[PDB]
Design a binder for this molecule. Structure first.
Ligand SMILES: [Mg+2]
Ligand SMILES: [Mg+2]
Ligand SMILES: [Mg+2]
Ligand SMILES: [Mg+2]
Ligand SMILES: [Mg+2]
Ligand SMILES: [Mg+2]
Ligand SMILES: [Mg+2]
Ligand SMILES: [Mg+2]
Ligand SMILES: [Mg+2]
Ligand SMILES: [Mg+2]
Ligand SMILES: [Mg+2]
Ligand SMILES: [Mg+2]
Ligand SMILES: [Mg+2]
Ligand SMILES: [Mg+2]
Ligand SMILES: [Mg+2]
Ligand SMILES: [Mg+2]
Ligand SMILES: [Mg+2]
Ligand SMILES: [Mg+2]
Ligand SMILES: [Mg+2]
Ligand SMILES: [Mg+2]
Ligand SMILES: [Mg+2]
Ligand SMILES: [Mg+2]
Ligand SMILES: [Mg+2]
Ligand SMILES: [Mg+2]
Ligand SMILES: [Mg+2]
Ligand SMILES: [Mg+2]
Ligand SMILES: [Mg+2]
Ligand SMILES: [Mg+2]
Ligand SMILES: [Mg+2]
Ligand SMILES: [Mg+2]
Ligand SMILES: [Mg+2]
Ligand SMILES: [Mg+2]
Ligand SMILES: [Mg+2]
Lengths: 117, 95, 54, 155, 70
RNA sequence: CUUGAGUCUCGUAGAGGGGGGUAGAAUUCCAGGUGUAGCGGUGAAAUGCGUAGAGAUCUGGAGGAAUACCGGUGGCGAAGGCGGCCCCCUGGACGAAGACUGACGCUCAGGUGCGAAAGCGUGGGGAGCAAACAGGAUUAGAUACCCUGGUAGUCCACGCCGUAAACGAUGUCGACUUGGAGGUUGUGCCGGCGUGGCUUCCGGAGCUAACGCGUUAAGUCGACCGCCUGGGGAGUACGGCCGCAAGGUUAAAACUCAAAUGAAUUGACGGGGGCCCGCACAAGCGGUGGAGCAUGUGGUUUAAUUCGAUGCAACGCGA
C-alpha cells in the first residue's frame, strides 16, 4: 500500500529462464514474474519474447505502489537481458540508470566438468 | 516385416527357407519399422551369393554377400544389414 | 526454374547463415567486392542475433 | 524451386461480373477440366447469396471472403528432435488463395442437396462468422498466436 | 558497465550505450568462458592455436598484394 | 704460457626454491527482513527443491579453495614444474670495464639425489569439484554418453611410491658453414649507428625414403655415454632386488606368421567443410495401399502346369 515513487528492477537472465523483481531501494521485494510463470514452457520459456511478457506482467503487479523512477540492474547472459529493459519502458517507467551486475570470480571455485554432447 | 524368397539357380528347400526366416527375425531389434523385404539366392559356377532388399519407414536398404556355402552367404548378409539398419535408426532418433 | 535468382540477395543470405552458424569472416567465397559486401553484411547482422539465441 | 519461375499466367475475368478474382474462384472449384459446370455452380450460388443479403454479388461474395482470409500462418521447422511451428506474415495473393480454398473445402463437406446450395450456405455463413471455413482460420490464427516467441528466427 | 541516463537523452540511446558499455567490458565472453572447467593443458593448447593463427593473419596483408587474380 | 675452465669488483631482469603474513571477487552454508508461486534442469523430459514459504532481493556472520584484468608463440628453472600483494632465509643466469689463478677440462658404466597426476600410511581439514555409489532419462538393450544428488579424493603437515605421449617422440660437450622478419634482456657511441645473452617464425646450400631439418641442424666434424637388430607370444613368465600395498625394476623360452612397419600417390568414402543444381524438399493437384474385376509374378498344385526376365535397372517383361 505505502507508495514509493523510486524503485529498482532486478533481472536474472539465465540460459533457461528469466526472473524479474521490482524492489524498494533498500531491496525489499514488491512483485515479480518469470517466463515460467508467464505461461511458457521449455523451448518457449527460454526466449526474449517470454522474458518480455514477464517484465510487463511484473509491471502490472506493482501498480498498488508509486512508480515513476526505476533503476534497472541486469545479471547473467540469458536472452532475457534486454527484451525486459525494453518492456519496462513501454510499461511506462522512466529508467534513470541501468547496470550489469553479473558476478565474476577473480581467479574462485572449480566450475563443473564440460558436457560431452 | 513381410518376407519374400527367390531362387535364381537354386531350389528353396525347407531348411533354406526355415533357416533364412529365423536369421531375418533378428533384424527387427535393430529397427522396429521394417516393412516387406525380398531375398534372392544365386549359384553361378562356384559362387554362392545372397542379396536382400528391405523396405523400411522412409528408406530402402540393400546388401549382398558371397559365401562358400549359402548358409555362410546368408550369415554374412545379416551382418551387413544390421550395420545399415543401425545407421538408419540413428539418423532419425537424432536429438 | 526459368531464370537464376538474385545473386546479391543470395550472397547476403549465405553470409547470414555462416554468421549464425559461427564461421569466421574470411571464409567468404567472394572476391567480387560487390558480392563480398553482401556476404559480410549478412555475416555481421547475424553476429548480433546469435547473442539472443540458445 | 532453386531458381526463379519466370512467366506468370493470365486469368481471363468472369464472363458475367468481369472479375479476375471470381475467375480464380471458379478454377479452384473446377474438377476434371469441367469449367462450364463450375461456371454454373458458382453463379447459382451468388444468385442465392444476393437474394438474401440483397447486397450485390461481386460485393457480397467479398464479405464472406473477408471473414475468412488469414493474416498469419505457421511454417514447420525441424529443431533438434523437435519441430518448431513458427508464425509468418501471409502474402496478399496467398490469403486470397487460402480463403477461396477453405470456402470450397468447407462447402463440399456438407449434407445439402446441390453443390450450389452448399456453396451458397457456406458463403452466407462465412459472412456471419459461422461455418467450418471460418472455424479453420480462427484455429490457424490461434496457433501462430501461441508460438509467437519464434517470430524472429530466420532459421 | 554502469550507464546513468543523461538529460533528455532518448531511451534508445541509453540502451545502445549500455550495450556498448559491456561489449567493451567483454562480460558475456567472460561468463561464456567460465561455464565449464578447461584442463590447464587444453587452455594452453588453445593459446598456441590463437598464436599460430594471428601470425598467419600477418601474412595475407602482405602476400596477396604480391599475387594477382585475373 | 693464456685463448678452455674458474675467482673477485659494479649493476640488471625474472610465476627459480623454502618459510610466515595478508587483501579483494565469487561460490556454498547459517541467522534475520521483504515477498509469493513456482524454481531447477534438458535436444525433449523427469528425478530433485518449494505454501513446513522456495527461487528472486537486502543485511549480518562463518568457512575453505583458487588467485580475473595485467598476460604476451612473455619470463624463470637440470628436468618434473613455477602466476594476487608484503616482509625473512636462499639458488642460478646475464652484461661492463678491469684485476687474479694457470689446463684446475669434457664425458661418465656402477653409485647418489631430484622426479607430474593418480595411489598408499599417520594426523588434520573439507567451500567448490567429483571416481565409486544411488535415482531420472535416452535406447532393441545402455552396468555409458545427458540430468539430479553424492563418498574417497582434490587442500595442509610428515613419511612412502618412482611412474607418464616424464615429447622437441631429437643424450651431453666443443668447433666450423649463405640469409630474412620478429620477441625479450644488458651495455657502447651519437631519436641513428654498434656490441652481448636468451628466444619465435620463415627460408638458402647441404642432408633426408619422403615428410621435412636448416648457425637453437636432422648440415660439416671431433670426445664420451645410452640404446636398436622381423611381427605376434611379451616388457609377459620364472628368479633376484626394491616397496606397507598397488606395484616397479632386471628380463627369457616354447609356439606361430611371411610378413608387420614408415612416408608419400591415385581413387573411394565420412553421421567433415564451401559453392552450385534437381518434382529432392517446400507450395499444390490427383492417385496407389481397402472392394470387385483384368493382368504379370511368387508360392502351392499338377501327368504337364514349356523356357527365359529378379533391388533401383524382373513382375500388362521376350509374347
Ligand atoms: Mg551444468
Ligand atoms: Mg553370424
Ligand atoms: Mg552476504
Ligand atoms: Mg703467473
Ligand atoms: Mg646410471
Ligand atoms: Mg637412481
Ligand atoms: Mg598427489
Ligand atoms: Mg584404496
Ligand atoms: Mg592421504
Ligand atoms: Mg583423512
Ligand atoms: Mg555436482
Ligand atoms: Mg555426474
Ligand atoms: Mg543409473
Ligand atoms: Mg610447507
Ligand atoms: Mg607429500
Ligand atoms: Mg618410461
Ligand atoms: Mg622416450
Ligand atoms: Mg653444437
Ligand atoms: Mg625452416
Ligand atoms: Mg647435430
Ligand atoms: Mg634421419
Ligand atoms: Mg615385439
Ligand atoms: Mg613385470
Ligand atoms: Mg618378479
Ligand atoms: Mg618384501
Ligand atoms: Mg600411413
Ligand atoms: Mg562429401
Ligand atoms: Mg511435398
Ligand atoms: Mg496429397
Ligand atoms: Mg492386398
Ligand atoms: Mg486393391
Ligand atoms: Mg515363369
Ligand atoms: Mg536357356
Amino acid at each position: 500500500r505505502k507508495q514509493v515513487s523510486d524503485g529498482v528492477a532486478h533481472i536474472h537472465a539465465s540460459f533457461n529462464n528469466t526472473i524479474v523483481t521490482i524492489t524498494d531501494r533498500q531491496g525489499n521485494a514488491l512483485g515479480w514474474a518469470t517466463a515460467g510463470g508467464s505461461g511458457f514452457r521449455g523451448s518457449r520459456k527460454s526466449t526474449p519474447f517470454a522474458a518480455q511478457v514477464a517484465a510487463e506482467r511484473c509491471a502490472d503487479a506493482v501498480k498498488e505502489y508509486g512508480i515513476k523512477n526505476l533503476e534497472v540492474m541486469v545479471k547473467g547472459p540469458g536472452p532475457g537481458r534486454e527484451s525486459t529493459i525494453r518492456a519496462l519502458n513501454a510499461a511506462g517507467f522512466r529508467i534513470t540508470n541501468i547496470t550489469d551486475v553479473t558476478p565474476i570470480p577473480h581467479x574462485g571455485c572449480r566450475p563443473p566438468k564440460k558436457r560431452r554432447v | 516385416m513381410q518376407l519374400n524368397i527367390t531362387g535364381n539357380n537354386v531350389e528353396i528347400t525347407e531348411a533354406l527357407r526355415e533357416f533364412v526366416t529365423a536369421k531375418f527375425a533378428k533384424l527387427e531389434q535393430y529397427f522396429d519399422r521394417i516393412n516387406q523385404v525380398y531375398v534372392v539366392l544365386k549359384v553361378e559356377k562356384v559362387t554362392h551369393t545372397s542379396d536382400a532388399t528391405l523396405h523400411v519407414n522412409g528408406g530402402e536398404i540393400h546388401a549382398s554377400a558371397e559365401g562358400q556355402d549359402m548358409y555362410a552367404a546368408i550369415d554374412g548378409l545379416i551382418d551387413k544389414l544390421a550395420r545399415q539398419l543401425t545407421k538408419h535408426k540413428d539418423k532419425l532418433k537424432q536429438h | 526454374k526459368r531464370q537464376k535468382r538474385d545473386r546479391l540477395e543470395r550472397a547476403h543470405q549465405r553470409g547470414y547463415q555462416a554468421g549464425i552458424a559461427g564461421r569466421s569472416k574470411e571464409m567468404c567465397p567472394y572476391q567480387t567486392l560487390n558480392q563480398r559486401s553482401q556476404w559480410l553484411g549478412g555475416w555481421r547482422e547475424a553476429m548480433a542475433d546469435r547473442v539472443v539465441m540458445a | 524451386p532453386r531458381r526463379r519461375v519466370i512467366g506468370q499466367r493470365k486469368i481471363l475475368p468472369d464472363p458475367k461480373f468481369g472479375s479476375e478474382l471470381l475467375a480464380k474462384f471458379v478454377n479452384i472449384l473446377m474438377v476434371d477440366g469441367k469449367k462450364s459446370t463450375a461456371e454454373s455452380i458458382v453463379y447459382s450460388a451468388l444468385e442465392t447469396l444476393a437474394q438474401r443479403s440483397g447486397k450485390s454479388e461481386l460485393e457480397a461474395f467479398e464479405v464472406a471472403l473477408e471473414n475468412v482470409r488469414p493474416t498469419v500462418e505457421v511454417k514447420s521447422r525441424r529443431v533438434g528432435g523437435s519441430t518448431y511451428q513458427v508464425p509468418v506474415e501471409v502474402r496478399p495473393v496467398r490469403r486470397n488463395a487460402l480463403a477461396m480454398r477453405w470456402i470450397v473445402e468447407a462447402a463440399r463437406k456438407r449434407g445439402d442437396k446441390s453443390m450450389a446450395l452448399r456453396l451458397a450456405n457456406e458463403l452466407s455463413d462465412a459472412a456471419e462468422n459461422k461455418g467450418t471455413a471460418v472455424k479453420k482460420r480462427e484455429d490457424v490464427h490461434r496457433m501462430a498466436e501461441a508460438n509467437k516467441a519464434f517470430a524472429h528466427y530466420r532459421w | 558497465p554502469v550507464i546513468k541516463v543523461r538529460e533528455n537523452e532518448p531511451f534508445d540511446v541509453a540502451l545502445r550505450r549500455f550495450k556498448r558499455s559491456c561489449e567493451k567490458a567483454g562480460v558475456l565472453a567472460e561468463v561464456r568462458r567460465r561455464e565449464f572447467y578447461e584442463k590447464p593443458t587444453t587452455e594452453r593448447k588453445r593459446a598456441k592455436a590463437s598464436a599460430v593463427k594471428r601470425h598467419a593473419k600477418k601474412l595475407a596483408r602482405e602476400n596477396a598484394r604480391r599475387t594477382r587474380l585475373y
